[PDB]
Amino acid sequence: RKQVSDGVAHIHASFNNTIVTITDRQGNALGWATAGGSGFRGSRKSTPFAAQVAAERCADAVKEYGIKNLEVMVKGPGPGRESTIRALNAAGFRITNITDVTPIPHNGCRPPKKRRV
């Protein structure tokens, strides 16, 4: 439809769920998928396998997309932070740079208290 011919995939991976969204360099989202929405409701959605399933499910259908080269950037503590890439790269888009954001707060915003369980 637009034939971007290049893009970047933002992965937000946490201990609870994984989200993957394809986007343009100018911050324009085309599609997204989540392990929770990929039929892994419960404890499996936090597993690496459900992350790669969502990655490939979001990467599929490249015809209308048109993104040939798809960079990658991950954020947060994921289920290895590598399985999603292992699936996405084989999905068809070659990877040349992966950046990791993982926002590290330089102090401030006192974290929540501890869990006594």
Partner: protein
């Protein structure tokens, strides 16, 4: 066991046919310790299957056993929480024995005429893939690939 390695001797090959697998099949099919009845029943079913399918005698059952053997099995595992169905790799001999047990129990649950014909029917429907052994066989395949990270 827990400390000493074990291993069982190999049963005698099946009479006349010389099929070690057939000799093991009569062992599994044996009930109350009567090899005569098991041998008669297995031979009756084998000849019935051969004449019904038009196939040879040795490999007619081999095809069905090949087509009713699984690849992975779920083992109940719970490291930190509740039970997790963790699929595992099946050993060769374990695969063979499991398929054999599946065939025998599937023939057991039938009610066609008698063991001689029920075993032949099970072999035929296993060759075709429309029996009950195959119906139970696809379950492990569908339940595989659940929890890899756990061990």
């Amino acid at each position: 066991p827990r400390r000493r390695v074990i291993g069982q001797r190999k049963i005698l090959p099946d009479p006349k046919f010389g099929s070690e697998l057939l000799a093991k099949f009569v062992n599994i099919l044996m009930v109350d310790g009567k090899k005569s009845t098991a041998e008669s029943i297995v031979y009756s079913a084998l000849e019935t299957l051969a004449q019904r399918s038009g196939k040879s005698e040795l490999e007619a059952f081999e095809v069905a056993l090949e087509n009713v053997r699984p690849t992975v099995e779920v083992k109940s595992r719970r490291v930190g929480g509740s039970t997790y169905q963790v699929p595992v790799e099946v050993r060769p001999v374990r695969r063979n024995a499991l398929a054999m047990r599946w065939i025998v129990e599937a023939a057991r649950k039938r009610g066609d005429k008698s063991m001689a014909l029920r075993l032949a029917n099970e072999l035929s429907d296993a060759a075709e893939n429309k029996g009950t052994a195959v119906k139970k066989r696809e379950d492990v395949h569908r339940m595989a690939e659940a929890n890899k990270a756990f061990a």
